A and B are shown apart, each in its own frame.
With several copies, the nearest count.
Chain A
Amino acid sequence: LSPADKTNVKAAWGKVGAHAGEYGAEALERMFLSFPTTKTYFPHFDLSHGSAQVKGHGKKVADALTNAVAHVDDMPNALSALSDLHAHKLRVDPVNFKLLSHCLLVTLAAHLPAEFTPAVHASLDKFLASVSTVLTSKY
């Protein structure tokens, strides 16, 4: 990531703040309704609106993205355990990282209108593309 993209990502994610866990839950809900093939990965979850488990898993996805922002420079080593889970154990199809990234971008657009510029949009896409690259790096 370029110095300008790091500054733009930190600006945007700063303003998300204490609502990150809530936005992580909305992104997972949007993905399951819009791309219903992704549901085959959560057969052990209640995937109805306001499910305790989806709220629970929203916080886990958000805390991991906050970590990735604090370690943007050493992402491969910050997420290396999550790269093992998603490739080796779970066997997640790489195409599915692009569907969740799109659903996160739709969630931030809807909550942060003032912050979601063309410039900031572009930098957040590169950032989520970087996070997806690491999470599929055991392939």
Chain B
Amino acid sequence: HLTPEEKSAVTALWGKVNVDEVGGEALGRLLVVYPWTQRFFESFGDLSTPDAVMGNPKVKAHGKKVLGAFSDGLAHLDNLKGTFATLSELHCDKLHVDPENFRLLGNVLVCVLAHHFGKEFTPPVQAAYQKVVAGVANALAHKYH
């Protein structure tokens, strides 16, 4: 549930997001800031230090696919539960990820958008994006309810 002037500031800012780098940036920071999430990603290789994680080609690659799911959710903010049905099944039944972790990735994304966009990432813009990342987090966690 976004207002017309919220949805227009969310869609406006996203168009300027370097879709290649931000995704890997968001996934790399989660693994470094909350180190328990590394056990889900053992096959990605060396996550021993912050320089090993950020410069890890499989992390950088996997980041594009996460951001690419965030890009599809915006397009369909009126049917997130649907958009994210297949990913809900994957994360909850196959992988067994605690839904507290979905919220942490959403929050780490917000800190990264802030890092790149600076003073253009205004308190009212952030309140609009905090609505999006919660709505994503809930949609992903549906198979647990």
Question: Chain A: residues with CB nearer than 8 A to chain B?
Answer: 26, 29-30, 33-37, 40, 87, 91-96, 102, 105-107, 109-111, 113, 116-119, 121-122, 125, 139
Contact = CB atoms under 8 A, between A and B. Distances in A.
B39 A35 contact: no
B33 A118 contact: yes
Q: Which 4 A-B pairs have the closest CB atoms?
A: A91-B39, A109-B114, A33-B127, A34-B130
B54 A106 contact: no
B50 A122 contact: yes
B116 to A, nearest CB: 8
B29 A33 contact: no
B29 A118 contact: yes
27 contacts: A30-B123, A33-B123, A33-B124, A34-B130, A37-B96, A37-B98, A40-B96, A91-B38, A93-B36, A93-B100, A95-B98, A102-B107, A106-B111, A106-B114, A107-B114, A109-B112, A110-B119, A113-B118, A117-B50, A118-B50, A118-B53, A118-B54, A119-B32, A119-B50, A121-B29, A121-B33, A122-B50
A26 B123 contact: yes
Given A110-B119, A121-B32, 12 more contacts: A30-B123, A33-B124, A91-B35, A91-B38, A93-B101, A96-B98, A102-B111, A106-B110, A106-B126, A110-B117, A111-B118, A118-B54
A94 B35 CA distance: 11
B115 interface: yes
Interface of B: 28-29, 32-36, 38-39, 50, 53-54, 96, 98, 100-101, 107, 110-112, 114-119, 121, 123-124, 126-127, 130
